[PDB]
Amino acid sequence: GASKLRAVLEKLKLSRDDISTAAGMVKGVVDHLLLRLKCDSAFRGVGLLNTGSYYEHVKISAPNEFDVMFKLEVPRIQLEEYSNTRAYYFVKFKENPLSQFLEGEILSASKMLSKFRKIIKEEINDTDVIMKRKRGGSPAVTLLISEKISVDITLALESKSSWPASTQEGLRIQNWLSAKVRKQLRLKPFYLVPKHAEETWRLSFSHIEKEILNNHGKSKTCCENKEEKCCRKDCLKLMKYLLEQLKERFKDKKHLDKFSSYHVKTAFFHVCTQNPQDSQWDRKDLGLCFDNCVTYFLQCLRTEKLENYFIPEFNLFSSNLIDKRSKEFLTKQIEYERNNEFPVFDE
Ligand SMILES: [Zn+2]
Numbered sequence: 015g016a017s018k019l020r021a022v023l024e025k026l027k028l029s030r031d032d033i034s035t036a037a038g039m040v041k042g043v044v045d046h047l048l049l050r051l052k053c054d055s056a057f058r059g060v061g062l063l064n065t066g067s068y069y070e071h072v073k074i075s076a077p078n079e080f081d082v083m084f085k086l087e088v089p090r091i092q093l094e095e096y097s098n099t100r101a102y103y104f105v106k107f108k109e110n111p112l113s114q115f116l117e118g119e120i121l122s123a124s125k126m127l128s129k130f131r132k133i134i135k136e137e138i139n140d141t142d143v144i145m146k147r148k149r150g151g152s153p154a155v156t157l158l159i160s161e162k163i164s165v166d167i168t169l170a171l172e173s174k175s176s177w178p179a180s181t182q183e184g185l186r187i188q189n190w191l192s193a194k195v196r197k198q199l200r201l202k203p204f205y206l207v208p209k210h211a212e213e214t215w216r217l218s219f220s221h222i223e224k225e226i227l228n229n230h231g232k233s234k235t236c237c238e239n240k241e242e243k244c245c246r247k248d249c250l251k252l253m254k255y256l257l258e259q260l261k262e263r264f265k266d267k268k269h270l271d272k273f274s275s276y277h278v279k280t281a282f283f284h285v286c287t288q289n290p291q292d293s294q295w296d297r298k299d300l301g302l303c304f305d306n307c308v309t310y311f312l313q314c315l316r317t318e319k320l321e322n323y324f325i326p327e328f329n330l331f332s333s334n335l336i337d338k339r340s341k342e343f344l345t346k347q348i349e350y351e352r353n354n355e356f357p358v359f360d361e
Pocket of ligand 1: 230231236237242243244245246
């Protein structure tokens with residue numbers, strides 16, 4: 015029931031101070047690294063993009079892990095869609111700081127990532143910060159702070175052009191946040207992160223995700239007063255915690271390894287579109303609202319369909335990305351939990 019769910023939310027608050035303190039340590043290192051990348055020629059125009067769960071106020075665990083995005087203003091970008099992926103692109107240009115990374119027409123993510131890593135390792139050595147390494151094109155590089163906090167740093171090109179055609183039917187917020195807001199948001203830049211699908215880049219809208227979370231009501235004053243305290247953020251925190259707790263019960267074989275907080279977040283945005291009124295997220299209806307989120311996530315698993323919220327034809331749950339057996343496995347676990355009032359949350 016809602017009492018059990020409220021107890022979960024109270025438990026998550028116990029970790030708030032550890033996360034904030036660690037976030038401050040990350041900021042100290044990031045600020046130091048950023049001011050020295052301004053010295054390196056290739057990345058002089060780098061800037062901090064304050065995206066990610068901490069800045070969305072929904073980081074509820076893992077105080078030793080942070081995702082940080084650096085942006086790099088890149089004038090005059092023309093994109094070329096890679097195959098028919100809708101989310102992956104080659105970067106071209108209509109001097110140029112990134113001129114040294116061009117192979118013919120195409121901007122090489124491999125060459126640019128290589129310099130980025132090398133330049134960061136050079137600046138890092140010049141206090142108790144070093145560079146770890148993991149799997150994936152983005153994050154580009156990883157810092158280890160005080161031999162304790164791991165910061166995944168993503169480099170993202172910033173394009174101040176209009177969003178790609180593949181986003182034309184995405185961001186379906188008109189009945190919730192308004193058509194006015196949708197137009198305003200689409201005048202904002204978009205980002206490209208280096209990401210294998212080759213020298214491909216993937217669209218990123220983490221800045222818009224943060225805006226939609228921190229200004230999330232139909233009412234402009236949602237969550238600015240006691241009469242309009244909704245449970246949207248609480249529901250996202252509970253969905254994230256549900257997935258984290260289920261993953262913890264398979265640390266051995268990591269059967270749920272393919273599922274991520276980003277899947278949860280994407281599904282949550284879809285539920286906001288489906289339930290656009292603030293009265294559909296009343297604080298007193300926490301249990302029902304959480305049920306709405308869990309049942310939609312279940313539907314995504316069973317139908318093997320979870321559309322990227324900005325790029326509808328990019329299906330995060332296609333069997334190409336996540337095998338059917340893994341989705342059926344998570345379906346069985348979540349179904350059991352839901353039908354039993356979430357014993358995973360029992361104390
Ligand atoms: Zn609210």
